[PDB]
């Protein structure tokens, strides 16, 4: 009586074929979460989800197998709109998602726990649908972040983190409207205080062998996004444009000073179950100390997802990377081998 | 047929607001949580529940994030009373939990993990209702732990752990009674052999740099309670003493020779849904070798909880540490600043 | 519509008394796991399970206390068999597992992630049932295994591990045959190629001090299984015979260059609940370099489980361990003490 509480999640058979070694082999692994409402009266909603992440394709006394995606409680009320907290997406998503759409790959000008660009501990989240029920389409977003800063030093809290996935005080918007048939278009910006171990880290070079800052100085991070999105008539056509200032990973050795980021995405749906894709990312950095300008990732990719029902489907997708090995792609630890992954996926 | 088992949870966005740095922050987590019966005949009943908390404020790579709170299978042959066994509350518990009804603080005078006072590993518990059916209010238990060691040592287990939350060898038992109205007196007492590297392990001064014996001398580890408690009237009054022998951490440099342990709560329940609360803690330990008498724990807390429904709920709770900073709880490491928490939490 | 899917699992409060302190003491867990099917055609059939294990035995700041036991996706074609493909049993399982029915020991002439020989990363598996609805009873298995590899060097793959749970590439085999009356027979085979680190690794031997190669030298691991079950008229019997080529692990030093391994169970069910087991294994290292021919396995055991109906049941099981403490048992660090266990175990 009152509460709506829906079990669900997948098991995904995954292989990736690869000449990157810490890429290739069995990726098995399970989702499972949590999706719950409760009508609090007619105008005002409670509602939680719980994401959870296990990994199978190591051992049973391996370690750190399984994580949490999603946690937050949230409150609804009706045309003034929805307020949520927790672990939950940073609203710049609400459009760089448009094109996260590829069969295994794609949606990776970015990473989780990366300021208010992917999945995000301890933000608030205000949501409104349209414009208040009066501009049908209009949705827009409001977000905060607190600090999620070291394990020790003057930027500690109790969550502590490396330095590639702290953040201090932040906020975020998001638009997005919907034009006549299928057409939307999306705006999101987002900026937050760095960190000192962010500012301060040093690090190794594969290449020289002597010590260096971690790329990127500044007090602020910062994302603008730009989204276009095609859905209608069986057909999928997405893309969207992302500037960044010290937000976008180099790897693992620090932030890029200035990052420009592209995804496109055309998928086209037979409706015998196929679902063909291609699709184009990069991601270019700049200004980034000793080594200037280099491509952060760059690939094509190529695949397909055969659903046999909505609980049922096999996908091939194909990563062709367009990177080529070098000081900076070797120093900050990027792969730039192909990726060939073959799925076998059961969703409940 | 015969079965019935029940899911169970919650999801608590959670944020902490604090001067102590190792404490602020994000705090957001869930419950999930596994209740079950099965009526064998008309005298025997089966059963079995597990709980898991799973930490939800830290990244996807981050270590330890998830851990079981209880897991227990039991029987129960009706007016005979019952027995279960595996990871459980200590029967003390049975008492001291009457004022564990804080929006989010108290019950700290006790960890986990900590002899019998709290949840438990590898405890059988037998528990008797209404003392055989003879006296309507009575109940009474009687439980056995056995030793939970080190990793290595003459006293290794298979389930080893830091001395802080070793055991040895134990039982305890407990009775509570009901008065009339809403009123109810309980008592309570444990009794365990303490462990080698308890009495055996240093640790070293944040505040002199030198080594010493970590706190607590004894072959024997001893709590007395008694509790009270008044329910009724939207009225909950409530309070609960213990005195403990080598049984009460001193943060993490060992135990208190003798500790004296006070916790007191008052609450309100309206029918609207909001429900305030005022309580008070201390924690007073002695004989603590070159510390003598000192607090180990000192607060007022003040706070609310507003339910929405059974499912729904939001709650602030201020923790005012009436602590001050010294060489007792700085070479113990034990928080002295205040707290403020915020949850919205959604419930299953 | 469409989804079947069930939760499934137990709760195992259960103790082991031994006088080897790393086996001894409370032993709690709990599983749980997921099974789906979703029918796509008349023919074709979706499925997917997964199943957990959560341990309850240690504390809350414990590490690594849960893992994955099964996670895989899969497809049934009705008369042209099935496939499915993630963490999963290697077939030599097929025939092994008629032995692995004591009531807490037993199954443990191999291990998890032990080649083929029991649950496994990355295993793709094709099962036929009645040789294609020809046989009734005659089912057979193929199936095909990647590398599982180390964290570094020549072997990594993405999932490394430890050498002894590392594998090549590698297949297996099976065929199981039901004989008239509850008569069934089986045989098994599979074959693997080594990883470098299980060639290439040292030891350092708790007798003499000194280092040593990992026991084991070879470019390909092994099996060899027949195997007979005897089940009607509440009679179990049952027995498989194994012999393997540098697949068998010897303690934590290596694999046995070959082993010869037997394993026989009888039980008898009595229909008020009570199914007394007498069992015995043992497993036989021929040729381990300076070991030369050493028991690595050999006990009786002895035991019984009294089911109060599907969802309960008590168990004792006694495990006579007839080995010898000597150098090889103690540098390979074999546990040749005696174990007591006793559950109490709540299943849904």
Do not use: C, H, M
């Given at each position: 009586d009152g509460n709506k509480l829906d079990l669900y999640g997948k098991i995904d058979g995954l292989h990736y074929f690869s000449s990157d070694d810490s890429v290739d082999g069995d990726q098995t692994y399970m989702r499972i979460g949590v999706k719950g409402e409760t009508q609090?009266?007619?105008?005002?909603?409670?509602?939680?989800?719980?994401?959870?992440?296990?990994?199978?394709?190591?051992?049973?006394?391996?370690?750190?197998?399984?994580?949490?995606?999603?946690?937050?409680?949230?409150?609804?009320?009706?045309?003034?709109?929805?307020?949520?907290?927790?672990?939950?997406?940073?609203?710049?998503?609400?459009?760089?998602?448009?094109?996260?759409?590829?069969?295994?790959?794609?949606?990776?000008?970015?990473?989780?726990?990366?300021?208010?660009?992917?999945?995000?501990?301890?933000?608030?989240?205000?949501?409104?649908?349209?414009?208040?029920?009066?501009?049908?389409?209009?949705?827009?977003?409001?977000?905060?972040?607190?600090?999620?800063?070291?394990?020790?030093?003057?930027?500690?809290?109790?969550?502590?983190?490396?330095?590639?996935?702290?953040?201090?005080?932040?906020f975020g918007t998001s638009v997005t409207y919907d034009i006549w048939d299928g057409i939307s278009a999306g705006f999101a910006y987002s900026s937050s205080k760095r960190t000192d171990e962010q500012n301060n880290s040093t690090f190794v070079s594969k290449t020289d062998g002597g010590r260096y800052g971690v790329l990127g100085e500044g007090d602020h991070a910062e994302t603008y996004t730009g989204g276009l999105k095609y859905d209608a008539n069986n057909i999928y056509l997405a893309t969207q444009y992302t500037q960044t200032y010290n937000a976008t990973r180099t790897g693992n050795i620090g932030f890029a000073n200035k990052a420009q980021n592209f995804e496109v995405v055309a998928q086209y749906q037979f409706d015998f179950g196929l679902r063909p894709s291609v699709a184009y990312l990069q991601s270019k950095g700049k200004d980034m100390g000793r080594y200037g300008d280099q491509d952060i990732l760059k690939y094509v990719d190529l695949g397909a997802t055969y659903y046999f029902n909505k609980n049922m489907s096999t996908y091939v997708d194909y990563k062709i990377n367009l990177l080529d090995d070098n000081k900076f792609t070797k120093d900050a630890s990027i792969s730039t081998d192909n990726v060939v992954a073959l799925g076998l996926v059961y969703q409940f």
């Open positions: 609090i009266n007619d105008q005002l909603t409670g509602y939680g989800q719980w994401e959870y992440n296990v990994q199978a394709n190591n051992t049973e006394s391996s370690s750190d197998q399984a994580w949490t995606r999603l946690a937050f409680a949230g409150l609804k009320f009706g045309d003034a709109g929805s307020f949520d907290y927790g672990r939950n997406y940073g609203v710049v998503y609400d459009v760089t998602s448009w094109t996260d759409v590829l069969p295994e790959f794609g949606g990776d000008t970015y990473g989780s726990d990366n300021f208010l660009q992917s999945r995000a501990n301890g933000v608030a989240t205000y949501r409104n649908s349209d414009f208040f029920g009066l501009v049908d389409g209009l949705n827009f977003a409001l977000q905060y972040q607190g600090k999620n800063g070291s394990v020790s030093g003057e930027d500690q809290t109790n969550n502590g983190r490396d330095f590639q996935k702290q953040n201090g005080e932040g």
